[PDB]
């Protein structure tokens, strides 16, 4: 064995994994068929993802990891082009053959700003963290085979001698070569069936300039300074600026549009589909009158997958290699950072005890598979809620209340870790949560609300129920559970901009 761990993929997941393991005394080799710099989506940070980066940073004493959670710290240390800003998620609803209303908006603001991650710069910086801590990296390589033996792993490489390790982590995405060879991936049982078209653009107009100013919308935050979701019956489109930070230099804006394949299947080239969308929804088109595409569109016809298992004696698939649902709500980054946080202490224990058995990693699998399942219910039910603004308004409080509870839970874990310095206590506290992979992590009342609300939405889809009935059923569920949630007034449906505290 020339290494302790081989990591496939040098993106943020592989890089952070490599950094924390190398920091902790393991000899790590990161392999990637691609090379930096390169484009990637997965751009909208969340409260959870920020807390998870800070937890990773504190758990392994790597300060630079925490920089990646704060836009001001990204600008200062990674570079001024490396992010935009977000003060929350905003949602504007539209329908075909009718004018769009600036009152069909919800936007619950954050207290602390978060980042729109320009992944080419963020990921390259992350790899630099790993390299500076002693992880080895080989870019632009070709893996010829991966052998999983009872005494380790052996990876054959084109035009080089094979490399050996005790353990292999797949930190790649849809191209997970372990996933392909292990036969663990499937689309069976997934409620979400969606496609995605995405690119980066110049000269994308702000929501306030294109559609309605703050004096009209009454939003507490500029939608320009938010992850903006334009939602409609068959899909949604994101507007994620990198050019909205007063000290930023990036000129681009990320644009992605997604369809529920059960309701609309695209047939034509990405630019033609984009123009058809804008004709259908002229309000959305107001962003793009002077816009130009700065890259080729990428089209993915089906973005959803899960896995039946993701750990063995000698391997672990990180979340992107295991399952993905949708960009909606940006749950992928969350699941990724939490999975690293759960896995890394176990890999260290394994390497120190020289014991490599599947059962040691079972809670990593339990978290990841539960997270993908929860993500599938969240997103599938959301796409059904896209049918009507009032329904969306009621529905978004189910997501928000859960996310707020999970964020608060992670914030508390971080506080305890910062002051106690007690890594083992933290690891055990995260593992002891009652609902790993669920939005609240540990609230039986919230998970009751989530389960029952998803049942309402699936039944509404299945039986084509009237949207007013569904919205009301959700509202009554929120009222029933509200006493056991954060005291934000989630049942006050007329307040479309739910504030913290
Ligand atoms: Ca070693
Ligand atoms: Ca994503």
Numbering used by the authors: 2 to 502
What wording appears in the published article?
A bacterial halogenase PltM was originally identified as one of three putative halogenases encoded in the biosynthetic gene cluster of pyoluteorin, an antifungal compound containing a dichloropyrrole moiety. Recently, PltM was elegantly demonstrated to catalyze mono- and dichlorination of phloroglucinol, yielding, instead of a biosynthetic intermediate, a compound that serves as a potent transcriptional regulator of the pyolyteorin biosynthesis, whereas another halogenase, PltA, which acted on a peptidyl carrier protein loaded pyrrole, was shown to generate dichloropyrrole. Herein, we report the wide substrate profile and the unusually large halide versatility of PltM and its crystal structures that reveal a unique recycling mechanism of FAD. In addition to its remarkable halide versatility and a very broad substrate profile for a phenolic halogenase, PltM is at most ~15% identical in sequence to other structurally characterized FAD-dependent halogenases, and it contains a unique C-terminal region (residues 390–502).
PltM is a monomer in solution; the crystals of PltM contain four nearly structurally identical monomers per asymmetric unit. A monomer of PltM consists of a large FAD binding fold that is conserved in FAD-dependent halogenases (residues 1–389). FAD and halide were not found in the FAD binding site, consistent with the lack of color of the protein and its crystals. The C-terminal quarter of the protein is a unique helical region not found in other halogenases. The putative substrate binding cleft located in the interface of the FAD binding fold and the C-terminal region leads to a conserved catalytic lysine residue (Lys87), based on structural superimposition of PltM with structures of Trp halogenases bound to l-Trp. Indeed, mutating Lys87 to an alanine yielded a catalytically inactive protein.
